[PDB]
Write an enzyme that holds these catalytic residues in place. Structure first.
Site, PDB file in Angstrom:
ATOM      1  N   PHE A  99       0.831  -1.198   0.000  1.00 39.96           N
ATOM      2  CA  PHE A  99       0.000   0.000   0.000  1.00 39.96           C
ATOM      3  C   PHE A  99       0.870   1.255   0.000  1.00 39.96           C
ATOM      4  O   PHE A  99       0.554   2.239  -0.669  1.00 39.96           O
ATOM      5  CB  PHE A  99      -0.943  -0.011   1.205  1.00 39.96           C
ATOM      6  CG  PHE A  99      -2.272   0.646   0.949  1.00 39.96           C
ATOM      7  CD1 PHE A  99      -3.427   0.132   1.515  1.00 39.96           C
ATOM      8  CD2 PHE A  99      -2.369   1.777   0.156  1.00 39.96           C
ATOM      9  CE1 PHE A  99      -4.652   0.728   1.291  1.00 39.96           C
ATOM     10  CE2 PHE A  99      -3.593   2.380  -0.074  1.00 39.96           C
ATOM     11  CZ  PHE A  99      -4.736   1.855   0.496  1.00 39.96           C
ATOM     12  N   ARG A 115       9.641   8.142   6.572  1.00 41.90           N
ATOM     13  CA  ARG A 115       8.767   8.503   5.463  1.00 41.90           C
ATOM     14  C   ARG A 115       8.425   9.994   5.464  1.00 41.90           C
ATOM     15  O   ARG A 115       8.227  10.596   4.408  1.00 41.90           O
ATOM     16  CB  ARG A 115       7.484   7.664   5.507  1.00 41.90           C
ATOM     17  CG  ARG A 115       6.478   7.994   4.415  1.00 41.90           C
ATOM     18  CD  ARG A 115       5.340   6.989   4.363  1.00 41.90           C
ATOM     19  NE  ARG A 115       4.396   7.304   3.294  1.00 41.90           N
ATOM     20  CZ  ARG A 115       4.533   6.907   2.032  1.00 41.90           C
ATOM     21  NH1 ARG A 115       5.579   6.175   1.673  1.00 41.90           N
ATOM     22  NH2 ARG A 115       3.624   7.244   1.127  1.00 41.90           N
TER      23      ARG A 115
HETATM   24 MG    MG Z   1       0.886   9.998  -0.244  1.00 40.98          MG
END
Ligand code: MG
Ligand code: MG
Ligand code: MG
Length: 339
Positions: free
Chosen positions: A80, A323
């Site tokens: 994902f 991230r």
């Molecule tokens: Mg995104």
């Protein structure tokens, strides 16, 4: 130390972190799965995979899940994330032809995963692999519901594609409806069921307390993500964010939007606490003395428990994952883990 603008004292005090005992194996296996499926370059996996804490997020979410179930969830979640990156790259480079085909391939693979296990597009085959494994835990009625929910998610992503290419910024209410689908609220809610090893009847899972608790749990995570991923989405020309919709339409400043998003995030927590009592009270009602009732009671109790866990897991995920560390990138518009 969590920054003041992102710090939530309630989560730190009332929502203690939990961690699945299978996590150490989860981290390595998922990393190996990304390599075998070729979803990321071999060097980017060596360099970034563990720092992304994708397995950490789910292991602090789906407590009490069987190892095989947690692994399938983690692999799916990892896909994902790399799909969100591929989606982002297709937009910035204007690959509308490539996206429409991938979009089409994902719809088909969702219905028949087995036929796409060895597709030429590794992103499709990686998807087929994790989805096929997820279909093996619960009866077909659950699989059908999962597919139905993810069909909507794909279209939401396609809707996001068109908005960013045209430059259209969705209204605050238009976004909140879209955010429920792009964050896959009901995908994560469905995954609670194989985690507790039980498919819930509609009369049980559509109970207002269960519904509301599941929703509020997903809203918090989705909206807190918008709050934490905001700087990286500003630099990357992303237009899908609650803060962005406020600044664009309601003409709020950068600091007014932050505080406005914060309050909505804070409301989710206290609203959850209120319905969590009702949801857990409902779980006690299911235990009528029968074996069936006891099974349904335990499943709901475990599910609501994991809805709670999501709060702490998401919160600490946004401050531990690389991230969102946009401040440590040479090019702020291009994340180093993204190719
Ligand atoms: Mg995104
Ligand atoms: Mg997204
Ligand atoms: Mg985000």
């Amino acid at each position: 130390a969590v920054p003041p603008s992102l710090r939530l004292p309630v989560i730190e005090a009332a929502f203690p972190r939990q961690l699945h005992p299978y996590w150490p194996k989860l981290q390595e296996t998922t990393r190996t799965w990304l390599l075998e499926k070729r979803l990321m370059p071999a060097d980017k996996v060596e360099e970034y995979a563990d720092g992304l804490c994708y397995t950490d997020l789910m292991a602090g979410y789906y407590l009490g899940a069987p190892d095989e179930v947690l692994q399938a969830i983690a692999d799916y979640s990892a896909w994902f994330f790399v799909w969100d990156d591929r989606h982002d790259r297709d937009i910035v480079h204007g690959r509308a032809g490539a996206w429409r085909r991938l979009r089409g391939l994902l719809h088909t693979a969702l219905d028949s995963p087995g036929d796409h296990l060895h597709h030429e597009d590794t992103l499709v085959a990686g998807f087929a692999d994790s989805v096929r494994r997820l279909y093996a835990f619960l009866p077909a009625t659950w699989n059908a519901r999962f597919a139905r929910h993810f069909h909507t998610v794909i279209e939401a992503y396609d809707r996001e594609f068109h908005n960013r290419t045209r430059g259209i910024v969705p209204g605050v209410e238009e976004y909140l409806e879209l955010r429920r689908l792009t964050f896959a609220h009901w995908i994560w809610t469905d995954l609670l069921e194989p985690s507790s090893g039980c498919e819930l009847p509609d009369a049980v899972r559509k109970h207002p307390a269960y519904r509301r608790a599941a929703l509020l749990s997903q809203e918090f995570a989705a909206w807190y993500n918008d709050l934490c991923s905001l700087p990286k989405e500003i630099a990357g020309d992303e237009v899908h964010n609650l803060g962005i919709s406020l600044i664009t339409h309601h003409s709020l400043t950068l600091e007014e939007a932050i505080g406005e998003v914060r309050r909505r995030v804070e409301e989710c927590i206290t609203e959850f606490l209120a319905v969590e009592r009702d949801a857990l009270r409902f779980a006690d009602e299911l235990a009528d003395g029968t074996v069936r009732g006891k099974e349904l009671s335990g499943a709901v109790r475990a599910n609501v428990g994991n809805m709670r866990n999501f709060f702490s897991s998401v919160y600490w995920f946004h401050h531990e994952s690389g991230r969102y560390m946009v401040d440590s990138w040479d090019d702020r518009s291009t994340p180093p883990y993204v190719n």
